[PDB]
Structure formats: C-alpha cells, structure tokens
Amino acid sequence: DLPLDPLWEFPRDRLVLGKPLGEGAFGQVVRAEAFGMDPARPDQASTVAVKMLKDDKDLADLVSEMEVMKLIGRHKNIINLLGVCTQEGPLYVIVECAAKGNLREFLRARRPPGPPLSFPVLVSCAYQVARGMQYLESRKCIHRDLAARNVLVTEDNVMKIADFGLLPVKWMAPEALFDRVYTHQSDVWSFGILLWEIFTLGGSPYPGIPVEELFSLLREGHRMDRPPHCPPELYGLMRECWHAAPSQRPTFKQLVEALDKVLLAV
Ligand SMILES: C[C@@H](Oc1ccc2[nH]nc(/C=C/c3cnn(CCO)c3)c2c1)c1c(Cl)cncc1Cl
C-alpha cells in the first residue's frame, strides 16, 4: 500500500524467485537470486531469501517485522535485512540466506554413528548465538522462542538468529511458563536449553518426559543432567541459566565473557 523507502527499496526486475525454504507462520520464505544487491558490483549475483505472504492480518505482521528489521540495523549474528519490494504489488522482504539451514538440523546431520563438530566448533556456535542475543537485548529487542531450530547457519558456520521483533514448553523459563511473563533473564533460561541442544549435537530436551509433569520436576529443583563428553565448565553455564530465581542467572554479557574464555582455551 503506502510508503516507498529509498534506503531499502529494491526493484522487482532484478529479483528472480527460486525454490521454497519453509515455514513460517508469517509467510513463506523462498530462495531467490538477486542481481546487484551490493551496488559496488552491480554484476555480483548472490543468493538471498525472500519472505512473502501466502494468501490478511499477517500483512500487518509482515510489514511490522520489516520495519523492526530496519530499526535494529546490521549485526553478524542475526538474519539481516537486504531490501524490500513494496512498489509493484506483492510485498517482498529480502533477507540473507543461511545455506546450511537451521542449527538443530546442522547438528543432527553431522552426528557420529555413536559415540567436523569438534569442540571448538560447538563452542563457536554457542558463543555466536550468545553474541547475537546480547546484541538484540541491547536494542531492546528479543526473541522468546530461542531454540536451535530458531538459529540459522551460513555456508561459513556463522550463526544467525532468525527473526526477532521489539507452546515450546521445554525451552520456557518457569515464570514465562506459569506466570506468562517474559524478560531477558527468561531468554537466558532458553539459551541454557539451547546450550544443551548444542552439546548433545541437536538432542531433544528432557528426553522421554511428556510435555506435562515437566513443570513438577522443575519445581523439585531437578534439571537435565550433564550430556556425555560435555566438559563441566559448560554444564556449569547451563545450570546457572536454569536457576529458578531470574536474578541468579547470568546475563548475556556474562555468558559472552564465559564462552569467550572457553574459545580462547586454544
Ligand atoms: C522458515 C525459515 O525461515 C527463514 C528465514 C530467513 C532465512 N534465510 N535463509 C534461510 C535458509 C533456510 C534453509 C532451510 N534449509 N536450508 C538448507 C537446505 O535447503 C536452508 C532462511 C529461513 C526457517 C527454516 Cl527454512 C529453517 N529453520 C528456521 C527457519 Cl526460521
């Protein structure tokens, strides 16, 4: 419908859509080839992802997400906005393409037969996700859902948090699960769960426990055990994230600093 933004408007003519990528609630995402995305070289073709409506009240969320992405600006560890097609019919939101898919699938696809994903790589994944979450928090933005399937992997193993904005019960903090309140510290609880997903190479949280009585065990002070071959330093981080009192869990800065110290152990 309305405005035309000269910092972001990109012509349909140099966008040829490709094969779908997935989901997601807000609309289908499709691979696409864009021409001249870097106006330095207007030849330099590149692979981008395009978010569209399916065909709506989702038009409101789609425009809303686009405007949010403009506000936050770039960062290494989020899916960044590249341009928008508002001018000749259907809305297109062009964002960067993570070639290796989501992090849980990246992990599961390279699992041993039992007992590549060396220890620096997995620490590198956790460090990058912590850096992206700290940045989103610093822009007063947030991403409740945070789970390994919410994280995308580029061709060069850069982690990018998909979507952010200004049911998944095994990732939710107690106060969000029961009091329906969400803060940065409840993200830290979810990041702890994501940490466990990473060092189980894409495992399912609380294996075997159906999605009910989980809450009673959390009230008993129980939490998932240390996964195999996970060093005690990283399990310590996980359990600090799973402290019941929100102010006793670490902030994303402290998680950044602790993970960075683990990366430096080289
Ligand atoms: C619903 C979908 O949203 C997005 C949003 C922005 C994106 N930029 N780039 C990708 C690449 C997705 C992909 C899927 N598979 N592969 C390898 C093989 O094709 C690549 C992508 C996906 C999704 C999916 Cl598709 C997966 N996990 C999380 C989410 Cl949010």
Author numbering: 453 to 507, 511 to 570, 583 to 633, 651 to 750
Question: How is this structure described in the published paper?
Answer:
The human fibroblast growth factor receptor (FGFR) family of proteins (FGFR1-4) contain an extracellular domain, a transmembrane domain, and a cytoplasmic kinase domain. The FGFR family has critical roles in development and tissue repair through the initiation of multiple signaling cascades controlling proliferation, migration and survival. The FGFR signal pathway is activated through FGF binding to the extracellular domain of FGFR, resulting in dimerization of FGFR molecules. Aberrant FGFR4 signaling pathways, resulting from gene mutation, amplification or overexpression, play an important role in the proliferation, survival and metastasis of a variety of cancer cells.
In this study, we have determined the crystal structure of the FGFR4 kinase domain bound to LY2874455 at a resolution of 2.35 Å. The electron density of LY2874455 is well-defined in the crystal structure except for the ethanol group, which appears to be flexible even in the protein-bound state. Part of the activation loop (amino acids 634–650, not included in the coordinates of the final model) exhibits no electron density, indicating that this region is flexible. In the FGFR4/LY2874455 complex, LY2874455 only occupies the ATP-binding site, and does not induce any conformational changes, which indicates that LY2874455 is a Type I inhibitor for FGFR4. Apparently, upon LY2874455 binding, the FGFR4 kinase domain was kept in DFG-in conformation. LY2874455 binds to the ATP pocket of FGFR4 through extensive interactions. It is orientated such that the indazolyl ring points toward the N-terminal part of the Hinge region, and the dichloropyridinyl ring points toward the C-terminal part of the Hinge region, while the ethanol group points outward from the FGFR4 ATP-binding pocket. The indazolyl ring forms two hydrogen bonds with residues in the N-terminal Hinge region, one with the main-chain carbonyl group of glutamic acid (Glu551) and the other with the main-chain amide of alanine (Ala553). The dichloropyridinyl ring forms a hydrogen bond with the side chain of asparagine (Asn557) in the C-terminal Hinge region. Moreover, LY2874455 in the ATP-binding pocket adopts a chair-like conformation that folds up on the hydrophobic residue Leu619 in the C-lobe making five hydrophobic contacts, and exhibiting remarkable shape and chemical complementarities between the small molecular drug and the kinase protein. In particular, key LY2874455-binding residues of FGFR4, such as Glu551, Ala553, Asn557 and Leu619, are all conserved in FGFR1-3, suggesting that the binding mode of LY2874455 to FGFR1-4 may be conserved in FGFR1-3.
